[PDB]
Amino acid sequence: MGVPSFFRWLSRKYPKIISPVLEEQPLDYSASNPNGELDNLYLDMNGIVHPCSHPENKPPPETEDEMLLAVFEYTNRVLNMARPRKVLVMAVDGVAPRAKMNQQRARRFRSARDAQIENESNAITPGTPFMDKLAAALRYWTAFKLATDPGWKNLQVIISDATVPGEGEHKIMNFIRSQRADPEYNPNTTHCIYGLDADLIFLGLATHEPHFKILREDVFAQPFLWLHINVLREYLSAELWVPGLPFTFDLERAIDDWVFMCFFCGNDFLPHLPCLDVRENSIDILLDIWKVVLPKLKTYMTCDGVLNLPSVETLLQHLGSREGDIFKTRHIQEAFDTDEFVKLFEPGYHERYYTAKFHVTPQDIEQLRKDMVKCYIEGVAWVLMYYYQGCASWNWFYPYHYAPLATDFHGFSHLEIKFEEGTPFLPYEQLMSVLPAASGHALPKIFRSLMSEPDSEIIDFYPEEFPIDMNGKKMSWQGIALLPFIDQDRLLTAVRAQYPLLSDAERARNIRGEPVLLISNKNANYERFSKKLYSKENNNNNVVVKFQHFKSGLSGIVSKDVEGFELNGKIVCPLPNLSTTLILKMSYRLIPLPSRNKSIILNGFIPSEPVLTAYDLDSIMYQNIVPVGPKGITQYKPRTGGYRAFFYFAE
Amino acid sequence: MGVSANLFVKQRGSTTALKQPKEIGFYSRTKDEEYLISDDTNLNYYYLPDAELDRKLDLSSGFQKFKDYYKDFEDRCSLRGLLETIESSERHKGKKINADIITFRGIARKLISCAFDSPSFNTVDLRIVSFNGQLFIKEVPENQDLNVFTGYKFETLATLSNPLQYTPREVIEKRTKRIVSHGDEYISVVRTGVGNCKLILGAEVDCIFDFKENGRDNLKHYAELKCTQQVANISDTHKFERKLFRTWLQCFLVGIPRIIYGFKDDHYVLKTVEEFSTEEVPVLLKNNNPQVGSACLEAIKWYGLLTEWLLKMIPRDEDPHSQIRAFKLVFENNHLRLSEIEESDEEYSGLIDGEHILSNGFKEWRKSLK
Ligand SMILES: [Mg+2]
């Protein structure tokens, strides 16, 4: 898509966050130009698999081999720009939670609807032969680099293929958070994310690691940009200020509340409130409400990923008081398909909007409203939990195509909220959930019969054409597919019945295959790891190594590969690698969190230099290249009343 | 008086440096005078974000509920845990640890400070010495109490009872209200030396900074957090520099790497915090106040002269621990250190010979058992 107005909002409010990527004219290890060096790098890998499989530039690659070649070319440019010195994480996208699947399914069905017009990219989901071919290929390309480039002789690489469940963006947060939980973790490791998504800004803040940078292509002006989280926290220190609070001000909690408002007023799982059309012209309205309400509360609204429902009701009540005028002002500013909503809002609001959307009688609406508001608030809780402490449930989802009105959010404050971590779906169950029948060639075609054959128990989940619903005068691609929500018990019992008919080679790639992988090349750990894991006492790998951040800038738990790798073996591209004298690789696991993650700055964090000045902050109370990494040794600012400060303050 | 000697305070030796220190083991002391050898319940973890300095934290708060357990102790300077820690470290390796003197770091700091501080301003105490086949040394127990409380509150505010990672958030939010208490230490046992003289020092340490290492010298990860004072006018720098110099010995004698000072404004309001490496301070003093900075190598040379003096002022190094012992009072008076045999005609001599009032029975039995 073309350059979103969201970046225009960012550049209008926060211009000093952006800086160009400094770039050169092939030796890896030489000091990089962009005012710092990176310890760690994280890849949103779908954010290159998609641009490869369906470019905005005219020529597509002609074959899977050429698509993979294009992926290797592009990743080589990315690493040569960023130069990670200690670790790299591949994070391929995987099996998603139900709340994600039932949103993705609609986009997936709409693509097959568009393919009928094109006859006159759905292979990129987990479990397909294409992603399996990528999972062989990307590992090989990494092994080749570690074996042949000496600049990487200290580097560690972490690989999390499509067989590993969880959304890639969530795999990354779990990695960051489990490293951050190690007592030996260096408080000042520099971090970077590559990825196309706007949400990454909020997730950077949600780590509370202030040394983050985000790497992106600007759609206008092939240049690249850094966005510095380090500078955004500096901006928010002015923007989030409120005088006279009864509880003490605290920047981490204010930032968590602001991140919560951003996920609330525009979301990847829930439908948007009709009042709150798009983030970039909406966040500032809720922020003004928060700045008005905050001094009446007992506390900040969020806490380590948990809500305070009593407080949130007061904001939503204030928004309800504005909701009518927000509808008026939207209409004043204007000066098969189902999209007709000419009744607007002013006659009766919810009393007539509800029957227009849901086809429900006016006597039933109180019950429907009460149930929808419960479900939407549970969704807002599940979303906040998802990013702050991982998914509460893989089984949970929002039951409806539409959101309540702002007037409707009250009486939920009495609630207490609960969840279970019930196991996510297998690869073919994931595919059966999201694929339209046209794309059914991607499954073992035994399953494809259940999508298409008129005898199938589950045909209701595979409509060949479906009702679609455009809103807000969006005369564009943006229509909501009103598909029936899947009964997972009906689907899973229909799908699992086919399993004993499948080949052992088709049970492969439908087993979970849960291990993440780690690769090394005469690294600081090499002999220790080799000595236990491959010259093991047992042929059966019961032997496992735990390891800690201090020695090599990474921590985890480590064990032999399941893949038939061996210490003296060598291997071939799907340009032989000679691993037998060059590499060791292992199954890998995160150290599980000792206790719930805290939104705090860790002990021993040193700030970078400040970038803003009094003229910037006083404008908010109404650029160039920039440094990265710690500004020297001292953990505390110079201040009046102190020995080392006295000579400094006296120049 | 079977033996007696003096040393003039301003005579100085020649050896330029201490030996490299090493950590033998540790113990922690309960509120109940129970000693926990090889146990670390009392080891705090440092934690105070730079944003906390914005809050108007008051170091007097909770003074009326201060639990000063140390006043109630039966033997306020008892070496028992150090002796039992050395015993625990000797037992699993079948031999005596070759150190010439066993003592607390506070005693050693008191002794070395004699070269610089007048005995009244020093509060230089009575000291007692004895031998078995090596020397042992003990100190004789002796608005300003709010200044004492201030340090204990500041050390309580700046730390956690467990690692930050493992601490649940409620324990951080409660912290300003928490009761404050004294006589509840974690004490490390440090092997060290000066010239050809080898030592064991028991030393209290406030907190660890990076992380615990299991079964290894944690010594490179400790800090001292020092009782706070204001600095706002030029003469305050010299008053601070004297305190810093006293603080440098207190880390250097046992290789502790980090010194942290908090600063008050007035009343008991905390204003700022600053940090120094133990290796900076001699040079920092050498720049800002040379007559103070100079004292470091003078103190080390004096510590050499002292320890050779102790090992030559008619000590006994009679190696069979079944031999008859000897016992001495020690004082600093009129620019002389003084040393004198406690004659068996005095009740204190009969006590220190016949009873656990200096050295514990279990320790005496352990060394008699070779
Ligand atoms: Mg202290």
Side-chain angles (χ1 to χ4, degrees), chain A residues 2 4-7 9-21 24-29 31-32 34 36-43 45-49 51 55 59-61 63-99 101-103 105-112 115-116 121-212 214-267 269-276 278-279 281-297 299-322 324-332 335 337-338 341 344-350 352-362 365-369 371-415 417-420 422-447 449-452 454 456-459 461-463 465-469 471-472 476-488 490-500 503 505-506 508 510-513 515-530 532-535 537-538 540-545 547-565 569 572-577 579 581-595 597-614 616-617 620 626-648 650-651, chain B residues 2 4-15 17-18 20-21 23-53 55-94 96-109 111-120 122 127-141 143 145-226 228-264 266-285 287-304 306-308 310-311 313 315-322 324-344 346 348-350 352-354 356-361 363-368:
Chain A
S5 61
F6 178 74
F7 293 88
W9 170 82
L10 291 177
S11 70
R12 183 167 63 249
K13 264 288 179 83
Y14 314 119
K16 298 184 179 182
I17 295 173
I18 291 167
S19 58
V21 176
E24 297 167 53
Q25 67 166 233
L27 183 62
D28 178 271
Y29 68 81
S32 68
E37 293 285 305
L38 281 301
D39 295 300
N40 298 26
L41 179 62
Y42 312 120
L43 303 181
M45 195 62 66
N46 69 319
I48 69 171
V49 174
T63 66
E64 298 182 329
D65 193 17
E66 192 166 44
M67 294 152 72
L68 292 165
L69 174 63
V71 161
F72 292 179
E73 192 281 335
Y74 196 98
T75 50
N76 185 73
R77 169 162 51 270
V78 170
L79 299 190
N80 286 9
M81 295 148 60
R83 309 192 196 234
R85 309 312 292 237
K86 295 185 179 64
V87 68
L88 174 64
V89 191
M90 296 296 174
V92 180
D93 201 22
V95 176
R98 276 273 267 153
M101 289 193 286
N102 289 94
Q103 207 286 335
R105 175 179 161 72
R107 174 165 60 260
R108 209 159 302 292
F109 269 62
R110 205 196 301 104
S111 80
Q116 310 317 305
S121 62
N122 291 332
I124 77 176
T125 53
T128 69
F130 176 70
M131 298 302 282
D132 191 24
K133 191 173 293 182
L134 175 65
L138 187 66
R139 289 192 288 172
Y140 197 82
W141 175 91
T142 301
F144 163 73
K145 283 283 193 176
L146 285 169
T148 61
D149 189 332
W152 295 16
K153 186 162 288 182
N154 77 317
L155 179 64
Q156 309 205 238
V157 191
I158 296 181
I159 307 186
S160 307
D161 301 321
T163 193
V164 184
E167 184 172 42
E169 178 180 300
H170 157 83
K171 293 179 177 170
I172 286 166
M173 298 297 279
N174 280 10
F175 177 81
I176 293 154
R177 190 165 287 139
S178 57
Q179 297 304 313
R180 194 178 199 260
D182 181 353
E184 298 178 46
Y185 175 86
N186 177 343
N188 299 292
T189 58
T190 50
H191 291 284
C192 182
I193 331 176
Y194 167 80
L196 301 181
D197 200 323
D199 292 354
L200 298 177
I201 292 173
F202 309 127
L203 301 184
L205 294 169
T207 68
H208 286 294
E209 296 302 273
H211 300 303
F212 261 64
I214 293 173
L215 176 62
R216 161 173 282 105
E217 290 187 351
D218 174 22
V219 183
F220 173 65
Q222 50 278 356
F224 288 83
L225 279 60
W226 304 114
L227 276 70
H228 293 290
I229 301 303
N230 204 349
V231 177
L232 178 55
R233 298 173 100 257
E234 199 175 332
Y235 270 124
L236 288 175
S237 180
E239 178 65 293
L240 303 183
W241 176 249
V242 184
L245 302 185
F247 51 86
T248 191
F249 192 98
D250 210 38
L251 187 61
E252 288 93 307
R253 275 185 166 141
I255 286 180
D256 290 357
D257 278 13
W258 184 87
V259 162
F260 158 82
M261 287 189 286
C262 296
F263 280 115
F264 177 82
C265 67
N267 197 274
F269 304 94
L270 309 184
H272 321 298
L273 303 193
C275 186
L276 306 180
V278 182
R279 291 178 178 164
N281 60 252
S282 177
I283 292 158
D284 303 74
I285 310 179
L286 300 195
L287 181 57
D288 286 347
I289 285 177
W290 183 93
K291 288 182 182 180
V292 166
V293 169
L294 189 66
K296 300 301 188 177
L297 303 182
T299 63
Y300 288 106
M301 305 188 306
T302 63
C303 182
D304 304 326
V306 182
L307 296 173
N308 178 289
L309 309 179
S311 68
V312 175
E313 277 194 346
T314 71
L315 283 84
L316 301 183
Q317 287 164 5
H318 275 286
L319 177 63
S321 82
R322 299 192 184 191
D325 298 341
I326 293 163
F327 296 118
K328 293 173 195 162
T329 52
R330 285 189 195 296
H331 292 307
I332 290 161
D337 307 50
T338 58
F341 302 105
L344 309 189
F345 301 96
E346 301 93 307
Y349 294 89
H350 66 78
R352 182 276 309 150
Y353 162 95
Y354 256 86
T355 197
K357 293 305 192 180
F358 304 103
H359 194 189
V360 178
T361 51
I365 302 308
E366 299 303 319
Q367 175 60 17
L368 182 61
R369 179 284 319 301
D371 186 79
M372 282 185 170
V373 168
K374 180 181 177 182
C375 297
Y376 202 90
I377 293 296
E378 281 185 6
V380 171
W382 182 103
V383 165
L384 187 65
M385 188 63 66
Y386 182 79
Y387 292 126
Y388 278 73
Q389 300 198 46
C391 60
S393 292
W394 303 90
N395 295 334
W396 184 95
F397 70 103
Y398 182 66
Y400 307 107
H401 298 292
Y402 277 100
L405 285 162
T407 48
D408 309 343
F409 286 98
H410 51 252
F412 64 84
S413 166
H414 76 279
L415 185 63
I417 297 173
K418 295 184 179 181
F419 293 115
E420 313 82 58
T423 311
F425 291 8
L426 304 184
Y428 298 159
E429 294 153 18
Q430 164 68 101
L431 286 181
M432 284 294 288
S433 181
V434 301
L435 290 179
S439 303
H441 61 265
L443 275 159
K445 286 184 176 178
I446 183 170
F447 299 102
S449 75
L450 307 187
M451 303 190 181
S452 186
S456 162
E457 300 83 357
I458 63 172
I459 298 161
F461 307 150
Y462 306 93
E465 179 167 31
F466 51 81
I468 186 167
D469 182 350
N471 283 271
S476 68
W477 57 265
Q478 294 166 8
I480 302 175
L482 301 184
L483 309 182
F485 298 104
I486 287 163
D487 174 0
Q488 69 201 46
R490 182 174 168 194
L491 184 153
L492 293 171
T493 53
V495 171
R496 288 175 178 175
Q498 314 316 311
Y499 289 180
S503 176
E506 296 168 331
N510 198 48
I511 59 176
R512 181 177 170 170
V516 173
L517 262 58
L518 174 65
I519 312 187
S520 295
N521 59 337
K522 320 302 181 169
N523 173 270
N525 300 278
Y526 170 89
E527 192 281 333
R528 180 184 177 194
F529 289 182
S530 180
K532 292 194 175 191
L533 299 183
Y534 284 93
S535 56
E537 299 175 31
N538 290 326
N540 53 295
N541 184 228
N542 75 309
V543 182
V544 177
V545 173
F547 78 109
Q548 287 283 111
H549 189 89
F550 179 77
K551 180 159 286 189
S552 68
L554 177 65
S555 69
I557 303 169
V558 191
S559 40
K560 199 190 289 183
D561 281 14
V562 297
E563 302 286 64
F565 178 89
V572 67
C573 184
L575 307 182
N577 61 17
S579 49
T581 197
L582 298 178
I583 280 183
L584 201 81
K585 61 180 183 86
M586 291 143 292
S587 55
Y588 176 85
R589 191 182 300 121
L590 305 183
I591 290 159
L593 306 183
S595 187
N597 177 53
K598 286 169 285 287
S599 291
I600 57 178
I601 289 162
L602 281 177
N603 180 43
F605 155 72
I606 311 301
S608 306
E609 297 188 35
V611 179
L612 307 187
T613 191
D616 306 325
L617 308 188
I620 286 164
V626 288
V628 175
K631 193 205 181 183
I633 296 170
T634 311
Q635 182 168 350
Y636 301 104
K637 298 186 185 82
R639 291 171 199 260
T640 53
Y643 180 88
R644 179 161 275 172
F646 180 93
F647 302 107
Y648 178 87
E651 305 173 38
Chain B
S4 186
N6 307 344
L7 180 61
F8 172 61
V9 162
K10 308 184 180 181
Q11 181 174 359
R12 295 183 184 149
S14 307
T15 56
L18 277 61
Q20 183 179 9
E23 187 170 40
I24 308 182
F26 53 86
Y27 72 87
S28 49
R29 173 162 64 186
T30 64
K31 291 167 169 78
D32 306 341
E33 300 190 79
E34 308 188 332
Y35 288 84
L36 309 181
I37 65 188
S38 307
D39 196 3
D40 63 9
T41 59
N42 294 9
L43 175 55
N44 309 289
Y45 299 79
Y46 184 80
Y47 176 64
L48 184 82
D50 172 68
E52 300 285 78
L53 306 185
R55 310 190 212 287
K56 307 308 182 293
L57 304 184
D58 179 346
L59 297 176
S60 68
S61 178
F63 171 62
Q64 297 79 7
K65 63 178 185 182
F66 175 38
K67 303 193 73 171
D68 193 4
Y69 293 91
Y70 187 66
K71 294 190 302 186
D72 301 348
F73 285 9
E74 295 177 2
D75 185 12
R76 310 206 306 269
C77 304
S78 208
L79 309 181
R80 213 205 82 206
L82 174 61
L83 276 46
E84 196 166 359
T85 303
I86 293 167
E87 163 178 12
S88 78
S89 72
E90 286 185 342
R91 274 180 176 281
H92 75 276
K93 70 193 300 180
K96 299 178 299 195
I97 289 165
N98 58 314
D100 310 318
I101 322 183
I102 287 153
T103 189
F104 282 14
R105 182 187 68 172
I107 293 166
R109 202 204 79 207
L111 289 165
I112 294 170
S113 72
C114 299
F116 306 98
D117 291 333
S118 52
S120 54
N122 190 254
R127 281 147 272 189
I128 284 180
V129 182
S130 182
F131 95 93
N132 198 177
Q134 298 154 274
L135 296 179
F136 301 88
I137 311 185
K138 182 175 180 183
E139 182 167 63
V140 181
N143 178 267
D145 47 0
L146 184 57
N147 302 333
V148 167
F149 177 76
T150 294
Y152 305 140
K153 187 167 182 88
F154 174 75
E155 289 190 359
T156 303
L157 291 185
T159 64
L160 300 172
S161 60
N162 293 85
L164 177 66
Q165 291 80 1
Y166 305 164
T167 297
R169 190 163 189 137
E170 71 192 53
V171 173
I172 299 177
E173 292 185 353
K174 283 191 297 182
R175 187 158 61 161
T176 57
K177 294 180 183 178
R178 205 182 90 172
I179 63 169
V180 174
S181 60
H182 172 57
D184 192 16
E185 307 95 333
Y186 174 86
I187 290 164
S188 174
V189 180
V190 182
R191 200 178 188 175
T192 189
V194 65
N196 64 335
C197 325
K198 304 190 75 72
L199 296 177
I200 299 173
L201 301 184
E204 172 180 32
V205 302
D206 300 345
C207 60
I208 199 161
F209 203 87
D210 314 296
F211 43 85
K212 174 79 179 196
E213 297 187 54
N214 296 74
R216 296 184 187 285
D217 305 46
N218 283 252
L219 195 60
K220 71 184 182 184
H221 304 296
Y222 301 150
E224 169 84 67
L225 317 181
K226 197 61 169 71
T228 60
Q229 174 52 337
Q230 175 58 300
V231 173
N233 188 14
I234 298 172
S235 57
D236 308 336
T237 69
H238 306 323
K239 292 177 297 186
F240 168 85
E241 283 153 4
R242 291 178 181 178
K243 293 188 175 186
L244 178 58
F245 171 78
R246 291 184 186 119
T247 310
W248 180 78
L249 281 166
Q250 186 160 305
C251 297
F252 172 67
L253 291 165
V254 291
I256 285 166
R258 291 176 184 277
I259 290 168
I260 293 164
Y261 268 70
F263 299 79
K264 286 174 286 169
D266 196 4
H267 317 286
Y268 304 87
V269 177
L270 201 177
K271 283 296 190 75
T272 82
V273 177
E274 301 182 341
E275 183 175 4
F276 317 98
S277 169
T278 296
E279 300 196 334
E280 294 169 52
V281 173
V283 179
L284 178 62
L285 293 170
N287 289 350
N288 292 355
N289 198 352
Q291 69 208 313
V292 181
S294 180
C296 300
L297 289 174
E298 300 301 298
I300 291 163
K301 284 181 298 184
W302 188 94
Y303 181 29
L306 169 64
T307 46
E308 283 275 49
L310 295 174
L311 297 175
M313 287 160 182
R316 311 306 187 76
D317 301 84
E318 297 174 44
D319 201 35
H321 291 265
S322 58
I324 295 170
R325 293 170 61 191
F327 332 92
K328 309 193 182 190
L329 279 160
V330 175
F331 310 106
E332 187 260 305
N333 173 259
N334 192 36
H335 316 287
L336 301 182
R337 294 183 63 268
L338 304 177
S339 178
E340 187 72 28
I341 283 280
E342 295 167 273
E343 199 70 68
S344 64
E346 298 186 21
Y348 325 104
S349 185
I352 293 162
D353 182 16
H356 314 289
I357 193 164
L358 185 289
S359 46
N360 182 30
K363 150 65 164 54
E364 292 179 6
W365 320 153
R366 170 62 191 89
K367 269 181 161 64
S368 78

